[PDB]
Structures are given as structure tokens and as C-alpha cells.
Amino acid sequence: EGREDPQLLVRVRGGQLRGIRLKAPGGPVSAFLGIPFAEPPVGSRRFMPPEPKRPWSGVLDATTFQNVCYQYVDTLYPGFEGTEMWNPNRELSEDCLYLNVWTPYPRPASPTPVLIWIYGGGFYSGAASLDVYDGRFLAQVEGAVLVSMNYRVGTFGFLALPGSREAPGNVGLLDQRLALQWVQENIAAFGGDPMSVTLFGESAGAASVGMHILSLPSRSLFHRAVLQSGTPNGPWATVSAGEARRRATLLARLVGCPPNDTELIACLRTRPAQDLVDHEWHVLPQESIFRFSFVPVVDGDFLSDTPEALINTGDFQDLQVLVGVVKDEGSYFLVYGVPGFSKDNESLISRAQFLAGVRIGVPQASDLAAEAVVLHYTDWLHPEDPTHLRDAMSAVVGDHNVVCPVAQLAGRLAAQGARVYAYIFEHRASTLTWPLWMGVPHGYEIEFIFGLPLDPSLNYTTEERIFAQRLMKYWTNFARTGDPNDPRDSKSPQWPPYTTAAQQYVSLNLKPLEVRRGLRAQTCAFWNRFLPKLLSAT
Amino acid sequence: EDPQLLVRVRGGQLRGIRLKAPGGPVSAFLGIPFAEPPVGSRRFMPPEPKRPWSGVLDATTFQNVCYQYVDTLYPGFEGTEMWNPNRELSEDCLYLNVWTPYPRPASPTPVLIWIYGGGFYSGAASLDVYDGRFLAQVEGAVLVSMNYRVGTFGFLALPGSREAPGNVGLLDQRLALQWVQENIAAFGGDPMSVTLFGESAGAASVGMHILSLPSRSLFHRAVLQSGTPNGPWATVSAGEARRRATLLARLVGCPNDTELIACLRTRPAQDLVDHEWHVLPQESIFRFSFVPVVDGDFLSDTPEALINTGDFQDLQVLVGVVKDEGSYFLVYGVPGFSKDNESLISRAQFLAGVRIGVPQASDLAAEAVVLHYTDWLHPEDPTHLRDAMSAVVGDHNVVCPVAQLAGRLAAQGARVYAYIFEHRASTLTWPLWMGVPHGYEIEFIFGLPLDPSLNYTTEERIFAQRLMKYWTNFARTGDPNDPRDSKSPQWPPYTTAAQQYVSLNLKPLEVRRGLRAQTCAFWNRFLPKLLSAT
Ligand SMILES: Nc1ccc2c(c1)c(-c1ccccc1)[n+](CCCCCc1cnnn1CCNc1c3c(nc4ccccc14)CCCC3)c1cc(N)ccc21
Ligand SMILES: Nc1ccc2c(c1)c(-c1ccccc1)[n+](CCCCCc1cnnn1CCNc1c3c(nc4ccccc14)CCCC3)c1cc(N)ccc21
Ligand SMILES: *[C@@H]1O[C@H](CO)[C@@H](O)[C@H](O)[C@H]1NC(C)=O
Ligand SMILES: *[C@@H]1O[C@H](CO)[C@@H](O)[C@H](O)[C@H]1NC(C)=O
Ligand SMILES: *[C@@H]1O[C@H](CO)[C@@H](O)[C@H](O)[C@H]1NC(C)=O
């Protein structure tokens, strides 16, 4: 110390850090990357709840992103930006419990609202180090303090033998909770306001945010929440204790650890990380899409009951939530698992391929339930039209997994005292490499919220730059006040809260805010009210 | 005498009456006997042909109306009383009426045979709405309408017995069709061009003549207005007809089929009418006690089996519905409904209504109906719930059976033309909420707005004339389009692919596609699976 930039030296509970001065389009930002928030969850600590990071000596170098949690790397389309933008961009390691902080440069004078990002990737993948999660634009343009953490995914984060002490499950959610506790204790050192913390996430990250709303020890660590294209309720975000036990026992057998829980988990702990990753997909009970093997478990601890029970009986009076979906939630999910679909052709499918797709897309559905889906989604005026069947297949997967769980969440939260704001993101990035038929796929609003179009080198349009700026203002005004609307602006139309009566939501596209009523009201009544009765009475 | 009013039919001489229609005279031959009176020992028995007569038979007045239940729900109310018997009630009722141009046609003229509705428990060919004088005068048509036995008298069956075989009301209709073949040439009608047309139970009757081979040689074309042979109310199984006939016998104190039917034959007609409604298996609406039975004789199989397996090539069919098929049916049986208020109902009253409106439905099937018909944007809105209740009853009973019929007929070689009648008569005394109720297109097809004394608008007179042209163009050629009108829009045939139908209102023909395609997929494809697997 002495010749360094005095504005990049900060102390936290565990010791001294040295950050880096990053260039954002409009000026510098301070970034503290790869801060350890936990003891590496390696060896005997595998499958175990995280432990806080013991203090270190000297100045920890926080200028680069740290290891990405051990996960399956997507090699389906080599060289393809469409798939590779989501791939790990740092070394894979079980030693991965690190977080990143972006703040204005110089650090804020007065306490600043904090935004905490929780990434998606079906609870089997993802990293806080990805380019689309770059906090520099929100920090520079909006003066925000942005935090993102790495949390354990796959078997490492969610393999559970419920009731055991060695593998209790939900440890990836505990890693997220420990980063939330780290923020409470240390964010003031960066100029962050611990009394104004907004959680935001997409897909499995939004489901994670939802589970922090539904778990009491997490409630004291944040004040507001954003759930983008994901919810704690729904068919993929959780599993029962029985199903988690079945999947963990099957994976153990597949890697030569046959079953006492102590003996089984000890053997799993001896397995190389790649062995567990090589078999993680082999434990799913059916041929399915939008289903992940190791996800949060209804343990009766982190989740005292199913998210459906918790959202229906909870008092959400003290909560402000921003929720929404993209135009084509299911389109991407069709390219791996449904025969007839490809990113390289127009995916015009037959009726037979549609019926078959419905079985893969709704794996838990009986023959009667699958017929009810088919009959509801068929255009009886053009029942064999390949374009309609292709679009219906995308809608089945999007509605079942995202849109209707989101409508169910917004509805219950609003009925139970929360301030809810809902949107539909309909803008397709001019730079998108997925086919046009895929529309606005799952995750393609993220680069807009984070302000990536503000970087001139990324080649987005001027209109896309103005729209990203509008979006950053909605998200940060929501983080600041619990309302996305700017108080010093009446010209711009307003975003009304979502209510059970009016069911108002807004369209997020290049045009000004447009207020719409009912988020697939008829279709989601099918999924949320009828279909459970068909998967119950018969 | 007037030679234009003197006709010799196979049974003897008749004398008609010259009637005044707005545009000029018409010849009417009313109350022609086509069968031996089905009285005494002939009660419940198939009709027998009328024996010949001496002298000139007086055919100047309508004859007796078949014994039936008279509607007294709203006394003095035109809305209900227009459908009530307008002649004396008698079991001696097997008579038909003929209207022809005056003077009698020079060349053989296409024949239109009207079969009235009234849930197979009521109706008469003598009602003012069925007046053939306008079609005869304006279009030069030969119009025939017969009385057929309704209620227990027409459809009480002890299947397998010889004394009460069932479907005798359909046999009465068939005997009038045979009478037309043998005698219509004497009036200037063409027996080689006979179109059956009917509404509600009359349209279901027309449908059953399409599905029964001995009837097929008696007509060439058919019009089914707001009714079909398929569907939940038009037929009953042999087991259910036997159950209902046994229960009715019990209710009138009647203790072997021969012995039971003999006792029923001793009962005054009113005793049978007094208990006919008390044999229905549930609290229901749009359900009638004594209707055609699947006997394995007149109906060789269920109308659903027959429509799915039949060859309908060399057949032309005109089918359609009114805008608000179910609205009227809510006024009797559904709590919360009245003709005297706006009938704004609660959600509870809607769920309860769905049970009465779909009586065969399980708890799951009723929930599926409720969830499909609820507007999840306004689920408690009384106006939406009222309109949804009307749509449930209209769709279940009429619109979706019509869509199922049009589809199967078209797929199996018939030439089908479909419509939706959306014009509400300026003279309607039913509330506005009821829209265009079941049966209120009939006065337009028959040309009643052409009578200046009936106070319809000028636009309604022009529209009735358009409708009479569609119906008679269809009777003449099997195509309702005007070969004269070299200007469109043309009425396209209904196909399984394109599903084209037309709107019949004051505006020019408008071609639409899919007759409640999504909703009728629910009723015709999904709901049977919910009452089959569970
Ligand atoms: N060897 C083997 C054995 C069996 C199976 C598989 C591989 C794979 C596989 C194939 C290619 C790449 C990755 C996994 N999948 C397909 C899994 C499909 C899930 C895709 C998904 C769901 N959430 N994140 N991802 C992948 C991460 N990438 C994305 C992410 C997001 N959006 C995206 C939009 C387009 C393209 C990728 C996106 C938003 C959230 C961040 C992650 C399976 C699916 C099933 N159901 C069963 C077995 C396998
Ligand atoms: N005493 C007693 C005991 C139990 C029950 C009943 C009476 C009555 C009843 C009440 C008034 C008049 C006749 C019957 N109904 C209601 C049945 C009403 C059937 C409605 C119907 C169906 N087809 N014809 N009609 C009556 C005739 N009138 C009409 C007709 C048509 N359209 C109409 C439009 C508006 C009003 C009346 C119309 C077109 C075809 C001609 C007949 C019951 C209904 C049920 N489901 C169960 C028991 C009874
Ligand atoms: C698209 O490509 C896939 C894989 O090659 C194939 O299954 C599908 O039939 C193709 N569809 C079209 C429309 O060419
Ligand atoms: C931007 O466009 C230029 C062409 O002018 C191209 O060379 C560069 O690779 C593009 N970069 C991105 C990120 O699209
Ligand atoms: C309509 O009137 C009947 C009785 O005449 C009643 O049961 C019903 O509640 C009334 N509805 C309204 C909207 O007042």
C-alpha cells in the first residue's frame, strides 16, 4: 500500500480487499470481484451447508472473477454465441463460493440502494461472472450498488437425502442466503444501504428469489424482490423429499455408491466432480423438457411446506414485487428435447410431432390431461397447420412452466397484501442468433435490464440503447422505492400495480408502456384451476 | 264451385279454400286426413293409412291439434301463447295441410314439407308462424305441413313390444311423406323434388328421416333449423324409454307389456299429460320425457353411430342456429332467471345452473364447463355469468350438435350449407337479454313480415323476402344461392377444412369460418372423454 489507487482499497468482516477501476461507457466504476463469502465447500464439506469464510491476512486481490461452480458445459452447438454466452467463463471448481460488488467511482457518499442478482440455469448451471450479468452499467448510469454471488448448482448444490445431516438439501439456497448475510454486514463498506436491499433474478434465479420470500430466515435480509421468468411455485422449481431421495439414491448407484445415508453420502464425497456431472441427467423420471435433476427440495426446514401452500397461506403485506415474462418462454426448450425442432430450420411440425411434444413438455400429465392440453392448444380451424402447431408447442412449454406459475404468483401475492407490478417483455434483440421462429426466448431480456446496449462495441441500435436506459430506470426506481415509476415524470405513461380485480400488466418493448389486462387469463385458468383437478380426481 | 279448389287424391275428392296473401290469392287444402284416427286400441300404435271417403271432403279449416301440455306459465303473453294450440286438442289429429299458388301450378313445382318442433311433447302445423301462404304466393311453392303425435301418444315406448314399439310420431311424419309422394302431383307439386324442413324437435325429426332408410326414398333435400338427430335430448336408449314408460304407468296406477299398455290405453289423455314431466331422471332443462327411441328398427343404431358411418352422397343439407339458442330455456328451470327482470345472476347461481343445464355431467365435467365459460377477467360479473349460462345451454344442446352434424355430413359426401341467424324481430316481447331466442327465425323464413298488419319494419320485409329466396332456391336446386343475383357475396358450402358458414341478419351475407370451433371441440371431443374415462 502506498502507490495504489486509494479509492480501490476497502475492508470487510474477513479483511482487506483491493478492487479494480473498470471503464463503463459514461465513466469509471469500482468493481470488487471474487470476494470469498464462505469456506470452500470441498472434500468433507461437499453436500453440506456453507460455513462463513474465515478471516484472511493481507490484502485479498479482488480484481478478477473467481471460479465458476462445478457444472455441465453446453457443447450442443460449438462456436454458437446463442449457447456459449451462457457457458462458464472461468475455471470450474468446487471452490466457487465468491461474490462480486460493483459500485460508482468514487464510492457513494450517502447509503445507496443495493440490487442483489441471483442467476438462473435450471439449478444445474450458471455463473455471476457472465457478460450479461455485468453490473458496471447499472453502477455507472444509475449509481447503484450491485452484488452477485456464485452458488452451488447440480448435485453439489441440491443433491438431498432428506433427514440426513450430511446431505440435507437446499445447500445452494443456503449459499445465496450466506451472501445475503454478507451483504447485511459488509455492504456499508462500499457505500451500500443494508436497509434497502432488492433481490433480482431470472429463471432458476427468480425461483431462488421466490424461495427467499417463502423462507423466514431470508426475509430479514432483503426488502423487495424481482422475479424474471421464474417462480418458486410451478412444476420444475422444487421436488418432494421422496423424489429428491429417489434421485440421489439412483445417482449414487450410477456412480458405484450403492446403499444408511452416512455410508452412501461418504461414498459420493469420494467421487470426482465430473463423475457426478456425467450422470446428473440420467435420474429424471421421464423423457422431459424444462425439468432439472437437482433442484430445491420441500424439506420442511428451508421450505416449511410446498411453495404452492406457502404462497396460498402467506401474509405478504410488507412486500413489493416486480414479476414478469418474455414473449416466447418455451421456444428454446424445444430445440433440445422435442423431435421435429431445430435452430437451423423453421421447425414446422406435424400433428403427430405436436401430440408427442405435449407428452415430453407436460411429463407428469396422464393421457386425459395431455388430451386436454392438445385440445385447448389446437386451432380447430387449422388443426394440421405446421406453423400453428410449432407455435402452440412453444406456448404449451412457456405457459406450463413460466407464464401460468407467474400469473398464479402475482395473483396470490396481490390477494395477500403485496404490491405487485407485472410485465411482458416483447422486444427481440437485433443481435439475436437464435432463429426468428424462437421469438424473444427465455433469458433474452437480461442484457437490456443490465444495460449491455449502452456499450457501443456490442452493436445494438440507438432505439435499443434508449430502451435499455428506460429498463434500468424501472428496475432501480423499483429498488429505491418499491414503485418502477419515476415521480418526476407524468408524461411517460404509468405502470399500474397488478391487482386480482383489474389484473393490469405492462408491455416492455421499443414503444411507450402499454397497459394490458389479464396475463393469459383463460389459458392460465386451464393450467392453474382445471389441470390440477384432472391430475387429482383421475 | 271453383275448379282450382277441387282436387281428387287417392282417398277421394277434397275442397280447399282460396286465401288472400299480401300479393294475391293462394289455394289452401287444410285438415286432409292422412291416417286412421290413432284412438282407442290404436293409441301408441304405428299409424294406418286413411281409408277412402265418399263425396267431397271439406278441407277449408285446420283440424284438431294432437293431445299435448298447454303452456300456462305466462297467461296472455304472446311470447309463450304464440306456440300454444290454436285448435281443439284431440287424439284424432293425423291431418295435413297443403298451400299452393292460385291458380294451381302449370308445371310440377318443388315441394317443401314442414315438420314443427316443441320438444316432441307439443306443437301443431296450424300455428300462425307456420302459415304457408307467403311461400306459396311469393315463391310459387307447394308447402305441406302435417300433425304428428307428441308426448306419450307419439313416443311412449316399451321397446320390443308390438303394442307400444315407440317412434310412432316419426311414423306419422313418414306416412305424410308417403301421402305427398302418392298425391302431391294432383296439387301441381313435384314428388321428385321434396325438401323436408323443420325447427328444434322438427329439425331433429328431419335428421331422423335422413338416418332411416325407408324415409330416404320420400325426400331429396333437408333443412335442419336449430336441432339435430344427434345430441343430448333428441333420443333415448331402449332401456331409458322402458324405464320412463314403466314409471308413467305406475304414476297413473297401471299394473308383461301387453297388460301394462292395455291399462295405459284405458286412461283419459289428460291423465297421461298430467304426469309426463315426472319421469325425467334429473332436475334438467332442454330435456323432454317422450322422444324418439333407439329401437334398432326406425333407428338401426344411435344417431351418433349413424352420422359417423353413413354415406351421405347425393344429399343436400341446409343447417343452422339462432344467436341465443339457450336463453329461453333458462326462464323455466334455472333459479335467478326471469323474463320480467335483467336476470343478472351470481357465481353460485351460475354453478347451480350448469348442473341443471348439463344434467348428465359429473362434478369434474361441470367444473370443466364452468372453467371454460367463466371470463377470468370478470369472473363475478352478473351480465357475463347470465350470458355464459345461456351459451352453455345453447352450445350443449344446439350449436355443438349442429357443428358435429355439419362436419360428419360434409366428411361423408353431403353438400352442406350452414348459417347463424342473428336478427332479433322488432316485434319480440321477450326481454332484450334473451337476444334471438330459439324459434324466432321461423316467422322470417315463412314470410310473416310480408303481412302489413303484423307491424314488422320495411327492412324486416326485405330480409324475409331474402330468406324465402334462400330456402326455396335450396328446395329447387340444393343450393341457396340466387342464380339471378350475379352479384355476391356467395354462400359457400360448409366443409370440414374451411368450416364456412354465413350470417343471416339485415346486412348482406357475411362468410365466417368455424362454428364455435374451440368451444364445440370442448363439447364434441373433450367432454365425452370426461364422461367416459371418469
Ligand atoms: N449429456 C447430456 C445428457 C442428458 C441431457 C443433456 C445432456 C442436455 C443438455 C444438452 C445441451 C446442453 C446442456 C444440456 N439436456 C438439455 C437441457 C436443456 C436445459 C437448458 C437450460 C435451462 N436453463 N439453463 N439451460 C442451459 C443454459 N443456457 C441458457 C440459460 C438461459 N437462457 C437460455 C436461452 C437459450 C439458450 C440457452 C440458455 C436463462 C438462464 C441462464 C441459462 C437434457 C434434457 C433432458 N430433459 C434430459 C436429459 C438431457
Ligand atoms: N307442470 C309441469 C311439470 C314439470 C315441468 C313443466 C310443467 C314445464 C313446463 C312449463 C311451462 C310450459 C310447459 C312445460 N317444464 C318446462 C318445459 C318447457 C319446454 C320449453 C320448450 C321446448 N320446446 N317447446 N317448449 C315449449 C313451447 N314453446 C316454445 C317453442 C319454440 N320456441 C320458443 C321460444 C320461446 C318460448 C317458447 C317456445 C320453438 C319450437 C316450438 C316450441 C319442465 C321442464 C323440465 N326440464 C322439467 C320439468 C318441467
Ligand atoms: C429440422 O431439422 C431436424 C433435425 O435435422 C429434423 O428432425 C426436422 O424434421 C427438420 N424440420 C424441417 C421443417 O426441415
Ligand atoms: C460489430 O460490427 C463490426 C462490423 O462493423 C464487426 O466487425 C464486429 O465484430 C461487431 N461486433 C459485435 C459484438 O457484434
Ligand atoms: C328476477 O325475479 C325472480 C322472481 O321473480 C327472482 O328470483 C330473481 O332474483 C330476480 N332477479 C333480479 C336480478 O332481481
mmCIF file of C-alpha atoms in Angstrom, chain A residues 57 116 169 220 332 415 431 489 530:
data_model
loop_
_atom_site.group_PDB
_atom_site.id
_atom_site.type_symbol
_atom_site.label_atom_id
_atom_site.label_comp_id
_atom_site.label_asym_id
_atom_site.label_seq_id
_atom_site.Cartn_x
_atom_site.Cartn_y
_atom_site.Cartn_z
ATOM 1 C CA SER A 57 -4.372 -11.860 6.232
ATOM 2 C CA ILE A 116 -28.558 -8.493 -5.487
ATOM 3 C CA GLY A 169 -30.581 -30.492 0.589
ATOM 4 C CA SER A 220 -34.765 -10.180 7.304
ATOM 5 C CA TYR A 332 -35.664 -22.577 -26.610
ATOM 6 C CA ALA A 415 -54.674 -11.099 -2.843
ATOM 7 C CA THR A 431 -28.190 -9.043 -32.313
ATOM 8 C CA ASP A 489 -42.350 12.351 -14.675
ATOM 9 C CA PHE A 530 -58.577 -27.098 -14.197
#
